[PDB]
Amino acid sequence: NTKYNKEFLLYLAGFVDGDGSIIAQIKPNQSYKFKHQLSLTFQVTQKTQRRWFLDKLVDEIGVGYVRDRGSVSNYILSEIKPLHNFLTQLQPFLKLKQKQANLVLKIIEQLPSAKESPDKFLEVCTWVDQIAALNDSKTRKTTSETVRAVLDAA
Amino acid sequence: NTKYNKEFLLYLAGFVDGDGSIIAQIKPNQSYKFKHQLSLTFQVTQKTQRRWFLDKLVDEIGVGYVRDRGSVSNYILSEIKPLHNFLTQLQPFLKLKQKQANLVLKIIEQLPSAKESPDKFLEVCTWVDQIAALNDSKTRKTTSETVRAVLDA
DNA sequence: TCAAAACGTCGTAC
DNA sequence: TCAAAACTGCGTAC
DNA sequence: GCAGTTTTGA
DNA sequence: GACGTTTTGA
Ligand SMILES: [Mn+2]
Ligand SMILES: [Mn+2]
Ligand SMILES: [Mn+2]
Ligand SMILES: [Mn+2]
Ligand SMILES: [Mn+2]
């Protein structure tokens, strides 16, 4: 797998702790087996005027993309297995967001097996709670005990 | 005159490009020669719940302090001498605030010199102009031209 | 007078 | 059904 | 920053 | 985040 330079990871770890975001979501979607999608997102926000910085991350991380949303842009990394590679090498240098990073890694490994059982699928949903608790969460809606609800009504 | 660990500078440079501010101001104060104080501030902002992060900074930079303001806390470094030392070491790793880092570095070297002539001081004031230019400035008032605007008297 | 601190404001860039 | 994308809403932490 | 809701496209 | 205003203390 792609092995990133230490000096890059050190700088990048500091920037992510500043303006990055590591997100786990339970997305209500009827298309899905347990009526919910597990979504992981690594994200670095920056004012579009400085877009070049985010675009250079695409070059250096070697995967991911940049979306421009008006006056702000975001580098996005959603593909679950490059995510795993990248967060694995970054996680040792993160101070503020290390616990989130390690959970997202954990969820990724326990995700094939999260499709087998509603009991297991609930356990992983629990982990997502923990990630959102560690974040500066303000507008979250779908907890694991929301999944719990409509896994009983089924 | 401390030498900071390189693995530390690399990380801190990232965090600073993220939530840090390298501020140069011109402060209308009658007490001063030309009725203005040149002020330099290095600062890192964080929600107070993470004040421990800012604490650690103070410990590792060895100089500077932490201020609270309700929900938000700040690491602050203003003393001209260690500011020069620290920025000189940090500067080569910055990517978004490297320009500001250096302009400050050079305003400092010129500080005693700028206490000499009206012509010189306000040249330094246009270096301060440039620093707000690079920053996400939104509420600036005293620019370098309200400086000799006053020196028009 | 001067370095440096202390306290407030304001608009985003996250 | 699923991984992944696309887009919007929103309240701060800067 | 950290979510939400929706859509793609096999 | 990036300021402004004001005060300390020799
Ligand atoms: Mn931050
Ligand atoms: Mn929280
Ligand atoms: Mn930033
Ligand atoms: Mn920020
Ligand atoms: Mn600007």
Numbering used by the authors:
A (entry chain A): 2 to 155
B (entry chain B): 202 to 354
Publication excerpt:
I-CreI is a homodimeric member of LHEs family, which recognizes and cleaves a 22 bp pseudo-palindromic target (5′- CAAAACGTCGTGAGACAGTTTG -3′). Each I-CreI monomer binds its own DNA target region generating the catalytic centre at the dimer interface. This region contains two catalytic aspartic acids (D20, one per each monomer). The aspartic side chains participate in the cleavage of the DNA strands along the minor groove, resulting in the hydrolysis of specific phosphodiester bonds upon the coordination of three divalent metal ions.
To decipher why a G at this position restricts cleavage, we made DNA substitutions in the cleavable DNA target to render it non-cleavable. For this purpose, we exchanged GT in positions −5 and −4 of the wild type coding strand target (I-CreI_D75N_target, Fig. 1b upper sequence) by TG, generating the non-cleavable target I-CreI_D75N_target-null. The absence of the central metal ion in the non-cleaved structures, would explain the different catalytic behaviour. To assess unambiguously the number of catalytic ions present in the active site, we solved the crystal structure of the two proteins in complex with both target DNAs in the presence of Mn2+, which allows catalysis and unambiguous detection and location through its anomalous diffraction signal. In addition, Mn2+ is less restrictive than Mg2+17 allowing phosphoryl transfer reactions in non-ideal substrates, including the non-cleavable targets studied here. In-depth analysis showed differences in the occupancy of the central metal at the active site between cleavable and non-cleavable targets. A high occupancy level of the central metal ion is essential for the cleavage, and the lower occupancy level of the central Mn2+ ion found in the non-cleavable targets (46% and 74% for I-CreI_D75N_target-null and I-CreI_3115_target-null, respectively) compared with the cleavable ones (100% in both cases) revealed that the non-cleavable targets interfere with the positioning of the central metal ion affecting catalysis. Our results clearly point out that in the cases of I-CreI_D75N_target-null and I-CreI_3115_target-null sequences bound to the I-CreI_D75N and I-CreI_3115 proteins, A at position +1 largely deviates with respect to the usual B-DNA conformation. In particular, we found that in ~ 30% (I-CreI_D75N_target-null) and ~ 60% (I-CreI_3115_target-null) of the simulation time A +1 is not paired and is found stacked to the corresponding nucleobases. The larger flexibility of the A +1 in the active centre explains the low occupancy of the central metal ion within the active site, disturbing the positioning of the P-O bond for catalysis, thus inhibiting cleavage.
